[PDB]
Amino acid sequence: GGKKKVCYYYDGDIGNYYYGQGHPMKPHRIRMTHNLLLNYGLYRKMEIYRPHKATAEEMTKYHSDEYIKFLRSIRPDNMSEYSKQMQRFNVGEDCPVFDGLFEFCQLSTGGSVAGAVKLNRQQTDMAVNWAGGLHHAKKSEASGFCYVNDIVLAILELLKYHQRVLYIDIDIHHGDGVEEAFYTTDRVMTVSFHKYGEYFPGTGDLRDIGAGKGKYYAVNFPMRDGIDDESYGQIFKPIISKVMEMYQPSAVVLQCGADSLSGDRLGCFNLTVKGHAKCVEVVKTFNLPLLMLGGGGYTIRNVARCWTYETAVALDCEIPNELPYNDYFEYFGPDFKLHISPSNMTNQNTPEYMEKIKQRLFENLRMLP
Numbered sequence: 001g002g003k004k005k006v007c008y009y010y011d012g013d014i015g016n017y018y019y020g021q022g023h024p025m026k027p028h029r030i031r032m033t034h035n036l037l038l039n040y041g042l043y044r045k046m047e048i049y050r051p052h053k054a055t056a057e058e059m060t061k062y063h064s065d066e067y068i069k070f071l072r073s074i075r076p077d078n079m080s081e082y083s084k085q086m087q088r089f090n091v092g093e094d095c096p097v098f099d100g101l102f103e104f105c106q107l108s109t110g111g112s113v114a115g116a117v118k119l120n121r122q123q124t125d126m127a128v129n130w131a132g133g134l135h136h137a138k139k140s141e142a143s144g145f146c147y148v149n150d151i152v153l154a155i156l157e158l159l160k161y162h163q164r165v166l167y168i169d170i171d172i173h174h175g176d177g178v179e180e181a182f183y184t185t186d187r188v189m190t191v192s193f194h195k196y197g198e199y200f201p202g203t204g205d206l207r208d209i210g211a212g213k214g215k216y217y218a219v220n221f222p223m224r225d226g227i228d229d230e231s232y233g234q235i236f237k238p239i240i241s242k243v244m245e246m247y248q249p250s251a252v253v254l255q256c257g258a259d260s261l262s263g264d265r266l267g268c269f270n271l272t273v274k275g276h277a278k279c280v281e282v283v284k285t286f287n288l289p290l291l292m293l294g295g296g297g298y299t300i301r302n303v304a305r306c307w308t309y310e311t312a313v314a315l316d317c318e319i320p321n322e323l324p325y326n327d328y329f330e331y332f333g334p335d336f337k338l339h340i341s342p343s344n345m346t347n348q349n350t351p352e353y354m355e356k357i358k359q360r361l362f363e364n365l366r367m368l369p
């Protein structure tokens with residue numbers, strides 16, 4: 001289907017926001033990603049855009065006025081005056097108050113929405129916002145280190161020109177906030193692959209399939225610890241192909257959370273960067289307008305490797321395994337290579353389990369009109 005035009009959204013301020021001592025979410029990982037892919041020369045092959053800061057107007061296309069007003073007001077120095085509101089909107093633990101929090105949301109959101117607009121106008125085939133993918137935020141509530149749901153806002157922008165949008169989520173966590181926003185519509189189908197059982201956020205059962213006009217338009221593939229490239233690859237392509245055949249979306253949003261990689265600090269999957277990136281490759285083959293977004297990812301050297309490689313995949317541009325010098329080179333020791341090895345952790349997802357869950361999801365997809 002040809003090489004695709006790629007537009008890529010980055011603001012160099014993003015890496016300066018800080019969740020606080022001990023918090024595993026490190027926005028600095030976006031700056032590492034950017035610097036690595038610049039040093040591989042990938043700027044030669046794509047348009048690089050600085051996103052606008054999304055306004056309250058943009059954000060309240062989904063989020064409540066009250067919740068957005070609170071995000072705009074709350075600061076480390078006025079927290080004690082906002083104790084009640086902090087509890088109502090679930091801010092102050094997983095989702096702390098930090099300096100510049102609202103500007104941070106504006107930058108994340110701006111990239112996703114700017115990308116969607118660029119796709120709507122047919123000025124690009126693919127838009128990339130690695131600072132996006134905040135799949136847990138809800139209408140009036142922060143969750144899971146997410147405050148504003150850039151994905152939901154980007155999909156609402158796509159729905160202006162697209163009757164049917166497909167969302168795919170390869171983050172190790174269930175994309176509960178996106179699924180919830182679109183649970184009762186058939187105009188967005190949500191497909192999430194995730195660890196399920198005794199794991200954040202606790203949602204995404206096989207049996208959660210949508211409601212009302214959205215019944216059968218939510219798809220959940222629950223997995224156990226230790227899934228590897230071969231097991232994941234054998235279910236992802238057939239599920240996504242069946243979804244494409246039955247749902248026939250005209251645009252796609254792919255959340256590429258890198259916490260499904262081997263060695264992630266919060267994750268317990270065993271995927272390599274090649275295994276993860278094979279998902280990008282599969283989605284690309286359908287030749288649809290594609291918004292690719294970040295997500296979780298807590299071993300930051302591997303997040304940088306993952307999203308650098310996935311940018312190269314979007315560009316159909318082969319890059320060497322030997323890392324080029326970069327500003328964060330020491331983080332990539334002791335090997336200084338792009339690709340990673342899986343661990344020897346046991347895969348708890350048996351072949352039989354994977355095939356059985358796949359067959360249950362195929363039965364649900366036969367129920368589309």
Ligand SMILES: O=C(CCCCCCC(=O)Nc1ccccc1)NO
Pocket residue numbers: 022023024093094136144145171172173200257259266295296297
């Ligand atoms: O990656 C994510 C968000 C994961 C949210 C995990 C919340 C539980 C947790 O580990 N919280 C925590 C850990 C260390 C320090 C402070 C909070 N979504 O894809």
Ligand SMILES: O=C1CC[C@@H](c2ccc(Cl)cc2)N1
Pocket residue numbers: 025026027028029030108130131132133134135136144145146294295296
């Ligand atoms: O590096 C970053 C930019 C946005 C922010 C974030 C928070 C939560 C999720 Cl799930 C994904 C991304 N971190």
Ligand SMILES: [Ca+2]
Pocket residue numbers: 169170171172173174175192193194
């Ligand atoms: Ca997921």
Ligand code: NA
Pocket residue numbers: 182183184185186187188189190210214217218
């Ligand atoms: Na839906």
Ligand SMILES: [Zn+2]
Pocket residue numbers: 171172173257259295296297
């Ligand atoms: Zn995650």
